[PDB]
Design a protein around this nucleic acid. Structure first.
Ligand SMILES: [K+]
Ligand SMILES: [Mg+2]
Ligand SMILES: [Mg+2]
Ligand SMILES: [Mg+2]
Ligand SMILES: [Mg+2]
Ligand SMILES: [Mg+2]
Ligand SMILES: [Mg+2]
Ligand SMILES: [Mg+2]
Ligand SMILES: [Mg+2]
Ligand SMILES: [Mg+2]
Ligand SMILES: [Mg+2]
Ligand SMILES: [Mg+2]
Ligand SMILES: [Mg+2]
Ligand SMILES: [Mg+2]
Ligand SMILES: [Mg+2]
Ligand SMILES: [Mg+2]
Ligand SMILES: [Mg+2]
Ligand SMILES: [Mg+2]
Ligand SMILES: [Mg+2]
Lengths: 169, 58, 215, 296, 159
RNA sequence: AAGCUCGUAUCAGUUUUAUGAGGUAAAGCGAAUGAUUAGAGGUUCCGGGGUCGAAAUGACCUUGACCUAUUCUCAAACUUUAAAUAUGUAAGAAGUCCUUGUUACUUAAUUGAACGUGGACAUUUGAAUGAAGAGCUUUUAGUGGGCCAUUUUUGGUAAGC
RNA sequence: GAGAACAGAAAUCUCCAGUAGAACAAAAGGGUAAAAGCCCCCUUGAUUUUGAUUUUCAGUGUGAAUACAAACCAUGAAAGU
RNA sequence: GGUUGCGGCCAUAUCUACCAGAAAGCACCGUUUCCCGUCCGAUCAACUGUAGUUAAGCUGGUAAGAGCCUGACCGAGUAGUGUAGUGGGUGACCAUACGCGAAACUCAGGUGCUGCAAUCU
RNA sequence: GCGGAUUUAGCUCAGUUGGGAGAGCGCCAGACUGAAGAUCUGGAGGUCCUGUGUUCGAUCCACAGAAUUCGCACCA
RNA sequence: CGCGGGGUGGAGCAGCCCGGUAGCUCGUCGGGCUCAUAACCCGAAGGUCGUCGGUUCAAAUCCGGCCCCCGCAACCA
RNA sequence: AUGUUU
């Protein structure tokens, strides 16, 4: 009994946080460009602390945001890697959820040593219709409490759809 | 040898011996800092007013 | 050595606390301000006695520590460690300065006199007004003489005049004893720690129902 | 509730609320100050804004001056008045914005007695030009464009309304680099593309493409056009006739206002909750307290 | 060394009236100042341009010039044993219309009306203000107001 | 000192009325910042340790480190608030009101701005008190080591510092 | 604060809360939230002429600053700046 | 009286938690050829007003609500302070006389008002 | 008391630009020797003089001290 | 300000004095000889010539600015 | 050419 409080995928962000900025970074950018079908964005480092050799504004990561049916397809493809089993702790309090895969080459294109191996980070942001209220320029507002996404709502939606399951508390 | 540095002692008495005089307001005050565009137009307006008043004294 | 307290008895300077602009203040001699049975409930100690200043002056942290030690030791010896709760209600936040002038023959030769005389931190003192409470001690009504004598002993450690006053309040609360009794029998007082919380007729009814089940 | 919701008493006490229309996300006061602030050496001259606002399903085009008591509308035009001039569909598109700007310009000139002089651009061809002052005559009515919070983009319907108001005879200072048809790679505008957008050429071309393509989309979109038997090639003459009728009679015939304001007020007053009095609040508090005869 | 800058000792003078920070409301810019208008000077700390010197905070003067965003104000400054004419170029955010003469203008209109009605009805004007006069005789009744006798209270501590 | 122009008179180390400005005294810290005392309840997912736990924080003992509601005491270089004294301006004819002339300024526009012509209003011409009058000018002496008293106040233990 | 492979207590990605508790070259104070902060785009008003004004003040100088005028520009859709 | 565009004062307007909303309006909402902008039509742009919904925004109500606002022979004429004495007191400081006069606290009330224009069961 | 300096593994020291705690002599272990010394390899060794704050972190950017010392301390 | 000279492997120098092109010694490492060490013998590694720009069928070199070091000489706001 | 002790 809910007209348009239908939880749906707003976006899926694929992330490759490489420890360096060498050719591996370009290869990772090409990797997450291939399945996304969009030009990715380079993420510069903000500090130079320790243990990574990363420097201020070194372009150490690369990410891409996918929306709509392409995002849903990529989400299902990365879910088949995790065998449709995600931990409960994988679900955030605000109703989004994520997971990490390694050895991405097990789907789509093969090893291709010109490209190499990268694990990738999936994060899915979940909301309802009317999320524009918080993002539009004019009359920007806050989504009401009953319309906000919760971790329980996202867990229930994620087990209803994909016929998946969650794990221990 | 050190000496005194500053004091306002007796200064008000000195000022009030000849008094604090208000600055003698005049009608038609000076147009020193008035906007020069306004002043330029005011000159022509006053010239036209003077000529009109002279011509109209028949 | 330490200068005599007569040199810093009076509030001659503006308050000069340890701050961003001092950074070099020695530690106060008194570090403990609550002693005795400081965990006792408000119901346990109805009788409150105050050692109150009758002068505008400065009490050194050394004198505060000496008087606290004297009063606590006397009342502990006579009535027991847990027969009272003594609270020092003045904190030595004002820093005293000293312009150190080396004492020896020929000091004028290697001294600048009054040039650059601004002093270094010498100690700490509490600035008390007339009628300001210095010591508060709550206890049972039977321990009145012991408590009064303890504060009388502590008074010898302070400069100036101090008065022993029996408070009309219940313990360390701001309520006169009949009013506290009425509130307690009406159930609008809940023990929180060594102090109590009072039920107000304002705020959320759900919270005023949860706390203070006086309904 | 949450450890970050239900902010603390100190935070609430020290919170300074923005201006109400800034909290509502409606007024950009930084821009409004510069739009409204008059040269002090005029001492009464209002600065008229051509306020153009786009809601869903409607376009608001107002001419507004500022006072201490509040803003005062000199003339207002809406895109829901375009059916009177022969536009019944696409009431928020570029051509509707142009028509509304032309209507507000003509209505304001008629109100100010400046309609015969400053006829504007009667033969619109998409050429960039401002309403010039006539020689030895009153200067054209000058208004300044007020987008509001809408973003300045090359092709915006807000600049379509600007173009329509400028063509209507109002002097609205503007450049041509925000009109549809401006080539960002160079410094010239495309007058044919601007005229096409003025007369709905982009919408007609979309209609033709959708008809020559999958008909389900052309049946869902433009459904009212089919039900009104309006062809894509008819849009240019529809908007030309609308411009002619606007120039012919921009006199703001208002709605007949059935259900007079008093019965409107009564009907709305039926469906409104009233504030409980202090006696009722105390009664509810006493009832809630007496509910705990024991403890629930 | 000593420090006397342009904005020296203005730390609290030029503050923003706690919980009234941010943008200046539009009535300040919609105010109209004519030459001869009397204005009070109060610097707005958020507008750093056209700002008056700290000496003129709280000073009341007369507009002598009107520019695009500012007015010229005439202030008589006490220098030594006399007053010197100072001309300040102040943006409108730092001034407001003075109400030191609104009461005078309303009294002027009321006096004109009273004089006209006097010369229409009879002969009585009394158009000058008068200081608060001594109270006239009055009779104070005890009906329901019988005097209650008070006494000084004895000393007690209640601490 | 010399005076000069006037003297229906002008103004004032003062009050009153009206209207501003200030951030000191006080006050406040269950209000921001910085200090500061104590207990209480939640945080074992509190940082955890002891001890088991075959081991996990899992069961406890519990040192904390936070959060919540309280609590004692403070600030020249803290503050929501905020005096008293002191302080700016105004209390009219150089005013008010009505009509309309100039402009190359300004307005969409005789629109506004400023300066005007003409007309009307003297018992209190628009608070109090006072006024060996007011205003103005020139030219010159000496002085340019200060000190004391009440009150506010800085350094200093203090000083006839 | 809650979430994601390596990746932990600091890397990158996401959401929520967040009156400024950040940042604005430097000392401190004031000021600033669709900004004065961060990023991006275009630029040279850090230009010309000579006056007026505020502070310091003798109402001198110097420094600094304010508001105009007469030009030429920059920017923006524009008001403006 | 509701709603919208522009607003004035800028919390009596804010914040938290629930509830309700007829009509219209607003809104969410549907699409990507065109102008335009993005990693992503999410934002921004354009198109449709059609496919749907009041779920959210928004509005209003509720709450011994937080905050905020107002008032008080509430605290308190208290603190402080101008003026006075060959007043008290070793002093610290204090009292008195003629005046001005808080803040905290407590209690009570309140929770946007309003301008222009348009529109509405 | 003033004006300065330095403080780093047991010893001498290098850091230092918002690098990163390191090198010799010591010690240990293994080589070599019949066995020593000498050499030759490898390793450990500091919570950078103490405490508090500002930085994304910190000897190093960065406050109050503590220790060790050098120069001056004069005219009667 | 002026005139000059110098900067080259970790260190000290040549090659520069007109482009045919980076070398000598010490130092480091590996091996060889010796019972072992030094000398000795054979290898390897080490600058691309103080920083940029300029002219050259292909410049450390020739030219012009600039950084550091030294000598001499000069000095009205 | 040199190679220290027992
Ligand atoms: K004593
Ligand atoms: Mg002397
Ligand atoms: Mg002297
Ligand atoms: Mg002192
Ligand atoms: Mg001597
Ligand atoms: Mg803007
Ligand atoms: Mg202030
Ligand atoms: Mg500036
Ligand atoms: Mg001050
Ligand atoms: Mg104080
Ligand atoms: Mg002399
Ligand atoms: Mg901006
Ligand atoms: Mg200077
Ligand atoms: Mg969309
Ligand atoms: Mg849009
Ligand atoms: Mg609803
Ligand atoms: Mg409340
Ligand atoms: Mg006397
Ligand atoms: Mg032997």
């Amino acid at each position: 009994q809910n007209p348009m409080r239908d939880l749906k995928i707003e976006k899926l962000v694929l992330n490759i946080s490489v420890g360096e900025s060498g050719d591996r970074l370009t290869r990772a950018s090409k990797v997450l460009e291939q399945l996304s079908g969009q030009t990715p964005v380079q993420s510069k480092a903000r500090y130079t602390v320790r243990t990574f050799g990363i420097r201020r504004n070194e372009k150490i990561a690369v990410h891409v945001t996918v929306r709509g049916p392409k995002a849903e397809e990529i989400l299902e493809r990365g879910l088949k890697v995790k065998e449709y089993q995600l931990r409960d702790r994988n679900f955030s309090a605000t109703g989004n959820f994520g997971f990490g895969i390694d050895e991405h080459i097990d789907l789509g294109i093969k090893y291709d040593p010109s490209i190499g191996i990268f694990g990738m980070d999936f994060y899915v942001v979940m909301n309802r219709p009317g999320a524009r209220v918080t993002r539009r320029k004019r009359c920007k507002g806050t989504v009401g409490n009953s319309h906000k996404t919760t971790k329980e709502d996202t867990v229930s939606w994620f087990k209803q759809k994909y016929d998946a399951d969650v794990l221990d508390k | 040898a050190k000496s005194k540095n500053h004091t306002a002692h007796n200064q008000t008495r000195k000022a009030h011996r000849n008094g604090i005089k208000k600055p003698k307001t005049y009608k038609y005050p000076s147009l020193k800092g008035v906007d020069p565009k306004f002043r330029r137009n005011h000159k022509h307006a006053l010239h036209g007013t003077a000529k009109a008043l002279a011509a109209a004294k028949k | 050595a330490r200068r005599p307290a007569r040199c810093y008895r009076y509030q001659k300077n503006k308050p000069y606390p340890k701050s961003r602009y001092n950074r070099a203040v020695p530690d106060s001699k008194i570090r403990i301000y609550d002693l005795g049975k400081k965990k006792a409930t408000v119901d346990e100690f109805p009788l409150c006695v105050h050692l109150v200043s009758n002068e505008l002056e400065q009490l050194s942290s050394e004198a505060l520590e000496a008087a606290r030690i004297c009063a606590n030791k006397y009342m502990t010896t006579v009535s027991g460690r847990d027969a009272f709760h003594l609270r020092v209600r003045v904190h030595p936040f004002h820093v005293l300065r000293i312009n150190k002038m080396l004492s020896c023959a020929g000091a004028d030769r290697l001294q600048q006199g009054m040039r650059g005389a601004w002093g270094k931190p010498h100690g700490l003192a509490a600035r008390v007004d007339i009628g300001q409470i210095i010591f508060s001690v709550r206890t049972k009504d039977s321990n009145k003489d012991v408590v009064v004598e303890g504060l009388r002993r502590a008074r010898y450690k302070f400069p100036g005049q101090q008065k022993i006053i029996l408070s009309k309040k219940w313990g360390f609360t701001n309520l006169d004893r009949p009013e506290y009794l009425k509130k307690r029998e009406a159930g609008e007082v809940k023990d929180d720690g060594a102090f109590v919380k009072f039920l107000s007729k304002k705020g959320s009814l759900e919270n005023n129902i949860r706390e203070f089940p006086e309904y | 509730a949450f450890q970050k919701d239900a902010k603390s008493s100190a935070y609430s006490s020290r919170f300074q609320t923005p201006f109400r229309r800034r909290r509502e996300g409606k007024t950009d006061y930084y821009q409004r100050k510069r739009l409204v602030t008059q040269h002090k050496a005029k001492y009464n001259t209002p600065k008229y804004r051509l306020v153009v606002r786009f809601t869903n399903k409607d376009i608001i085009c107002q001419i507004i001056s500022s006072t201490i008591t509040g803003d005062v509308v000199l003339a207002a035009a809406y895109s829901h008045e375009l059916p009177r001039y022969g536009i019944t569909h696409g009431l928020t598109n570029w051509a509707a914005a142009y028509a509304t700007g032309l209507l507000i310009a003509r209505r304001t000139l008629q109100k100010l007695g400046l309609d015969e002089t400053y006829k504007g651009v009667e033969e619109v061809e998409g050429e960039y030009e401002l309403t010039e002052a006539v020689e030895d005559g009153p200067r054209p009515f000058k208004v300044f464009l007020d987008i509001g919070l809408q973003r300045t983009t090359t092709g915006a319907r807000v600049f379509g309304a600007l173009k329509g108001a400028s063509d209507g005879g109002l002097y609205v200072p503007h450049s041509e680099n925000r009109f549809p048809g401006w080539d960002f790679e160079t410094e010239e505008i495309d007058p044919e593309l601007l005229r096409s957008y003025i007369f709905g050429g982009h919408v007609s071309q979309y209609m033709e493409e959708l008809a020559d393509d999958d008909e389900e989309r052309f049946s869902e979109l433009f459904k009212g056009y089919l039900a009104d038997d309006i062809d894509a090639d008819s849009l240019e003459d529809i908007y030309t006739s609308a411009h002619e009728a606007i120039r012919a009679d921009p006199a703001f015939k208002p709605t007949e206002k059935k259900f007079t304001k008093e019965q409107y007020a009564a009907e709305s007053k039926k469906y409104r909750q009233t504030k409980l009095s202090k006696e009722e609040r105390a009664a509810r508090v006493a009832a809630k307290i007496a509910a705990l005869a024991g403890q629930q | 060394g000593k420090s006397h800058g342009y904005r020296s000792r203005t730390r609290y003078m030029f503050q923003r009236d706690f919980r009234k920070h941010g943008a200046v409301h539009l009535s300040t810019y919609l105010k109209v100042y004519k030459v001869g208008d009397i204005v009070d000077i109060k610097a707005n700390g958020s507008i750093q341009k056209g700002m008056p010197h700290k000496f003129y905070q709280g000073k009341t003067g007369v507009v002598y010039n009107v520019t695009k965003s500012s007015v010229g104000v005439i202030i008589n400054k006490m220098v030594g044993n006399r007053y010197l004419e100072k001309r300040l170029n102040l943006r409108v955010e730092h001034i407001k219309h003075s109400k030191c003469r609104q009461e005078f203008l309303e009294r002027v209109k009321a006096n004109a009306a009273k004089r006209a009605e006097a010369k229409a009805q009879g002969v009585a004007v009394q158009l000058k203000r008068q200081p608060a006069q001594p109270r006239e005789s009055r009779i104070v009744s005890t009906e329901g107001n019988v005097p209650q006798t008070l006494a000084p209270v004895p000393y007690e501590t209640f601490i």
